[model samples]
Target: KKLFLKRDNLLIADIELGCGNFGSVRQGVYRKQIDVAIKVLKQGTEKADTEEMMREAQIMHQLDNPYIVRLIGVCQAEALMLVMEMAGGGPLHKFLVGKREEIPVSNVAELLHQVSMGMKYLEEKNFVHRDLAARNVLLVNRHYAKISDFGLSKALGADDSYYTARSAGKWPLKWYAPECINFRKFSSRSDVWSYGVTMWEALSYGQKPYKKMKGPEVMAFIEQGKRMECPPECPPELYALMSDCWIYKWEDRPDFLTVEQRMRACYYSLASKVEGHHHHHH
Candidate 1:
């Protein structure tokens, strides 16, 4: 069922690239013009392991938005090769971890706004990105951010916008919401909770959320009806928006449209301040 090399004309080389769990992302050229990122899974990985790659490819190919990564092409014969748009700056985590000192608030705000817009688009189409975070968001350039790694996404409805119940195995607990933890139910509301965490990640320049916090501890805190606090450096209005998303009552959480408005407004507010500072300093 794989279609990695459609024709015998597909190119190959020994230039290995970055490695992941059961695959590697290689640098490649397609049609001899556009540069691309190719994700190839090893032959031995089970169908389940490669399911993520397939889902990501399927969903990404169907999506067309400035804030979403473009899936250029795919080949799945001997192996699964997913060709995607090349983003020179790499994933958002790279900058957050390695170049924190150089990141301006304006730049981070721009990235956050793009991410929010991407999520809003996904929601509009009734798709929920179950695995949204700094690590999954990619940087196309300093100014462009695209959501990537849609393997864990869940389509709402029978293709509508409502997710059915699913198990909440021991995933990245920090990013999981109280409802996902308590009831094993995920919805757009739960996704909103994750968006808040991702926003905090942007503001903190990629600090690990709930670092050193354990599952039992987190559960206990949530049982007490408490949620994680935003870092001190986070701006007030943004923190408030996160608070609205983190409302203990999942039913009370604002939708992505509300989130989009606030995030765009916040970005513009910060941008003006940055321009003002630059003008005054110069």
Candidate 2:
């Protein structure tokens, strides 16, 4: 059942929680009790914007995974508003920046494992998350991450694993797969390429990929058989998994399920080491 919220019941905050090109999100209370994140569309937004917002809501409605953000309801008065569960820790990248020094590698691995599991579910559902990055991953708590921002998502059709970009939509070039950059093709495999960059973001404490390089330069560099170097703190095994995702040919790249399995192995290994270290210390 779809929830149609009453505008009067939603208490919007004066301060903005976050702002993007489409609109602003604010901390709000629902029915004078439950706290929520309210995504309000910009005033005077066109029909296209309204449709996109609704599309995002519909996608969230279909998804029932814990590792994906949950849509609480919607308000369609004065302006369109989407009500979602508030992520207390905020975006993954920002969260990483604040606690990078204190966070253990095992914890980072667990977070990545959660993300990979979410992507695996999306892959099984034949949904291609055109954008996958640290900024798009929201932190539900200190140790848990959930995938968000589904405005660019598309469901596969008729044995199709790829979608060709038609519009001049804004794309994060640094996280794009080679085929996506050169031929406008997007698929679950392409998303794996972006996932590799997201892993780099975690390892580097939210550092931008290809530091100081412009979009065209990064594209050219990738085309010339080059890739981002492993972060100094990243384990060789984890970096190898990332390299597997960046394989130029989409077919050659590992699937999300494979990525999830590899991430699980990495997490368990780190966890055991941490446990052993604590025992030795005690």
Candidate 3:
């Protein structure tokens, strides 16, 4: 027996999904029923191995969440393929930058809330999503988010676990935590640091954090204890919340529950402010 998707090819856009270190994603239809993202590692690519592909498929098959991209099925031939939901809204970065004039603060807060919920779910399963970035995060709809790219995620204490120093942990420096920079170690706290950076990306609507600085420069600045501020138009309460997330001491950072509540409050507060000002249309 085989599953089939019912959609015409002409109506579907051939979207070139994001490129990865070892694979490429292409937009495709699944059994002609629903749009899907097909990730395929090139033939003979070093990272493209049967074992790793099967491991990823097994890991993904067990995950279920509104904020986590759904892994539908797998297809194997000369090359392996992992089929997933096609995020029509695309990556969060595109929404933040390309449509900055259209995105609102409440929307940004809502996105953060979605991510926090996703993180909470992952943590509950004792899993660590080593790579959490704007590029890995996708949008399912206007106010929904799904964290993807579990290629780097590993179960805690698993052989070749996420905390292994020998692994390539050089994440985007702009989003890394102090421990990640100084000790090459990552815990749930470090993931939180990435989440905070994700928040900054959303708040700024796709603007690169510390855009004028190089990775080393940003590292130096962070070491010197300089804190980056959110945009001027960002709400004071929300800005304060993000500032708190960047505290130098990892232990000082709040857990996902606290983070979730604060983000939810920020969303409602921003919505209230907008509603109050609607009468003074500029």
**Could you tell me every candidate's TM-score relative to the true structure?**
0.85, 0.92, 0.85
* lDDT tens readout by residue for model 1, 142-213: 778888877677777554234345544557777877777766667777778888888887787777877678
Q: In order, what lDDT does every prediction score?
A: 0.75, 0.84, 0.73
Report per-prediction Cα RMSD to one decimal.
Answer: 4.1, 3.4, 4.9
> For candidate 2, lDDT tens digit of each residue in 30-142?
88478788899999799988988888888778888878888888899888999988777788787788566688777788788889999999988888888899998988775
User: Which order, best to worst by lDDT?
Assistant: 2, 1, 3
Record all residue pairs in model 3 with backbone atoms less than 3 Å apart, i.e. clashing.
Answer: 5-31, 5-32, 5-33, 6-32, 6-33, 7-32, 96-205
- The number of the candidate with the highest lDDT is 2
lDDT of 2 at 109: 81
For 30-109, candidate 3 gives per-residue lDDT tens digits of 65467888777777666436567667766777788888988877776446777778887788987778666676777677
lDDT of 3: 0.73
Model 2 lDDT on a 0 to 1 scale: 0.84
Model 2 quality (TM-score) = 0.92
Model 2 residue 155 lDDT?
Answer: 77
